[PDB]
């Protein structure tokens, strides 16, 4: 993973997953952060 | 039981009152027993007077009271009464209705009313309704400020909605201006939305301020809680137009229909306290002796009474004694000096009751269709409605940013929709096909997507200026330097047979028809059913060579499972060309579009939108 802004995420995949804890923090930051938002929901 | 009704004013007896209760839940196991009298004029003096001189001939354990009257002052003293006597009142209509002080906790009283936070939320649920995100308040110094403040702050700032509040402006009206500091004030905010809160008359003042400030005219609108508007049967037309509202209703329940749910309410309490007791309620009315001995425990009641139900309808009331979600009507004012029913609401929930059309399909660089969240209901984010008839499609992307900066910049509005017949334009025998078709049908004005450009097309409609590089491009695994070198031109000029394609109806494939006829003719084998299918064909084998859009196939080339795909040679692509946009013929908005489009890399957006939407992460490597 390139980065922590990887083309990888940037390409997600069905194929290809990246896992998470709902109600985590960091959902917390993908929810409330406009700029990635999109990102969040994969 | 015994129960008593009032009614005042109106010049009128009136049959429709014993047709109001029309001997009303006669089922119940306890009966009521009505005593009416009305009275052509109301005195504080009178109405204290008549009521306790009816304690005397009917000895009533509630009451009822209604009034023809704008008057504030005629609920105050009913809660006075319910103080005096312990004898429930409450009122349907008018004064009764109006709002009060704070009621004492031992008072018992009821009116057809509610509160400011109630009605500051139905304000922020109008405003939700028709979307209006960004707002500010003007109030006065008058009752309830920064609590309407605190209460808004509160309910705006749970959600996850990123709404504006502009100004909040606190102004007395005490202290009155030579200055017009309330104008100075005013003038400033250059809010759309608008929510007042003052007296009825400081209502007029601000308004003759806001009708100087420019603040009344057309886009911005104006939202108000229940004291402005007050009767509704007076309205000074200082108020501008288009004023929304929210108030009582007064047809949804007839005078009638109010009173019969006011004695529903007053016997089917004393049910419940009789099912939990199974006491009498009834109790000596006489207010000038001392107040009758277990009276006291119709304390109880109340406490137990607060949520009266009748009709499978909510008469359950609150704290203050106001009812709960009391039917509330959402008004606005209608042209001339008209009060007209918008929206009802209730409880929780309330229910309310250059053009352009544009076509375009679903492709990959700027173009994607999605699924809405149906929990949601409507669309989400950058994602902009697009219809399909056969249903409602989000469509979303590179070409939809960048219509709506195009629309921004031209400041125009736009109905967009998709295409059902034949996709991209395409010429068959006589007639041809697609979006164009709507372009020339008039169905559509301007047809936007990842739609080439060809001399045919730009014959029939005049085109946008192009505003990313691509054309026709091949895609291969890891072969012709040339690319002009005839290996193409004949497969069987090598004995293995060899493999390409590309997507029929296409631009590409008409061009290939026009110029080069044996290469259309060998490929029709190869011709495939979509982009993703085409792609099945070059990624699992049993294809080569895989020939597209050269925009889509470099963005492909960035983004693959694997980078097992690349472009070919530099990807410097033959027909170079770029995407463009419909509009109808030499009439239209034509060159002040083109302008918008120069401008939009003008400021360099085109390379941040190329970053996000066209950047693949493959092709880094090499």
């Known amino acids: 993973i390139t980065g922590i802004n990887d083309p990888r995420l940037r390409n997600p995949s069905d194929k290809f997953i990246y896992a998470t804890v709902k109600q985590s923090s960091v959902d917390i930051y993908f929810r409330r952060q406009v700029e990635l938002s999109t990102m969040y929901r994969h | ?622």
Request: include cysteine; hydrophobic fraction near 40%.
């Open chain 2, 1 to 622: 039981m015994d129960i008593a009704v009032i009614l005042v004013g109106t010049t009128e007896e009136v049959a429709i009152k014993d047709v109001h209760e029309k001997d009303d839940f006669h089922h119940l196991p306890v009966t009521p027993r009505v005593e009416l009298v009305t009275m052509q004029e109301s005195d504080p003096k009178s109405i204290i007077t008549r009521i306790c001189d009816l304690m005397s001939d009917k000895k009533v354990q509630g009451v009822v009271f209604g009034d023809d009257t704008d008057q504030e002052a005629i609920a105050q003293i009913l809660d006075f009464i319910s103080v005096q006597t312990l004898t429930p009142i409450l009122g349907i209509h008018g004064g009764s209705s109006m709002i009060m002080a704070d009621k004492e906790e031992a008072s018992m009283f009821f009116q057809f009313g509610p509160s400011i936070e109630q009605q500051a939320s139905v304000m922020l649920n109008i405003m939700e309704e028709y979307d209006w995100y960004i707002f500010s308040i003007v109030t006065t110094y008058f009752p309830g400020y920064q609590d309407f403040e605190n209460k808004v702050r509160s309910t705006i700032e749970n959600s996850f909605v990123g709404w504006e509040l502009e100004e909040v402006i606190h102004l007395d009206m005490s202290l009155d201006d030579i200055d017009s500091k309330i104008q100075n004030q005013l003038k400033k905010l250059q809010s759309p939305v608008i929510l007042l809160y003052c007296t009825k008359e400081e209502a007029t003042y601000i308004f003759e301020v806001a009708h100087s400030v420019g603040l009344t005219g057309y886009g911005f609108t104006w939202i108000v809680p229940s004291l402005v508007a007050g009767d509704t049967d007076t309205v000074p037309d200082e108020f501008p137009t288009g004023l929304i509202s929210v108030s009582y209703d007064e047809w949804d329940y007839d005078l009638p229909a109010r009173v019969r749910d006011g004695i529903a309410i007053i016997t089917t309490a004393a049910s419940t306290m009789l099912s939990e007791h199974n006491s009498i309620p009834q109790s000596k009315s006489s207010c000038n002796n001392i107040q009758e001995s277990r009276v006291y425990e119709a304390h109880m009641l109340k406490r137990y009474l607060i949520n009266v139900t009748f009709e499978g309808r909510d008469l359950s009331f609150s704290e203050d004694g106001y009812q709960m979600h009391p039917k509330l009507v959402i008004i606005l004012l209608n042209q001339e000096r008209k009060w007209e029913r918008v929206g009802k609401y209730k409880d929780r929930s309330l229910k309310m009751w250059e053009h352009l059309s544009i076509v375009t399909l679903e492709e990959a660089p700027f173009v994607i269709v999605e699924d809405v969240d149906p929990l949601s209901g409507t669309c989400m984010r950058n994602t902009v409605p697009c219809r399909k008839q056969i249903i409602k499609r989000c469509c979303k992307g590179f070409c939809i940013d960048i219509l709506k900066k195009i629309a921004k910049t031209v400041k125009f509005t736009y109905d967009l929709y998709l295409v059902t017949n034949g996709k991209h334009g395409k010429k068959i025998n006589g007639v041809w096909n697609g979006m164009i078709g709507e372009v020339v049908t008039k169905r559509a004005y301007m047809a936007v997507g990842s739609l080439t450009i060809n001399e045919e097309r730009s014959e029939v409609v005049d085109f946008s200026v192009p505003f990313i590089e691509t054309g026709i491009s091949v895609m291969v695994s890891r072969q012709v330097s040339g690319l002009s070198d005839k290996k193409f031109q004949r497969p069987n000029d090598f004995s293995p047979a060899f493999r390409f394609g590309t997507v029929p109806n296409g631009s590409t494939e008409r061009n290939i028809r026009n110029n080069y006829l044996e290469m259309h003719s060998y490929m029709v084998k190869f011709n495939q059913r979509s982009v993703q299918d085409a792609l099945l064909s070059l990624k699992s084998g049993k294809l080569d060579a895989f020939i597209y859009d050269a925009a889509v196939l470099n963005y492909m080339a960035g983004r693959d499972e694997g980078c097992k795909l690349v472009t070919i040679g530099s990807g410097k692509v033959f027909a170079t060309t770029g995407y463009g946009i419909a509009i109808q013929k030499d009439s239209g908005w034509k060159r002040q579009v083109d302008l918008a489009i120069l401008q939009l890399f003008g400021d360099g957006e085109m390379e941040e939108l190329e970053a996000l939407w066209l950047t693949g992460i493959c092709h880094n490597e090499k």
